[PDB]
Structures are given as structure tokens and as C-alpha cells.
């Protein structure tokens, strides 16, 4: 939720990730 995203191989512009976006997704949350 917030304001995360799921992006595929990787995030981009961010390397903040929270978690597994399932598979071969990253979700990643601009949080800290």
C-alpha cells in the first residue's frame, strides 16, 4: 500500500525494498 511499488527484476528510482511483488516482482516502499 502507500505509496510502494511493484516493479519487475527490480524497483527503479528506489532501493527500498519490502517485500516479493510474487514472482520475479519486487515491491518496494519509499518509507525506510
Known sequence: ???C???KGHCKR???V???CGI????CC???
Open 18 to 20: 519490502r517485500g516479493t
Open 24 to 27: 520475479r516482482f519486487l515491491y
Open 5 to 7: 511499488y511493484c516493479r
Open 14 to 16: 528506489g532501493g527500498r
Open 1 to 3: 500500500g502507500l505509496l
Open 30 to 32: 519509499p518509507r525506510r
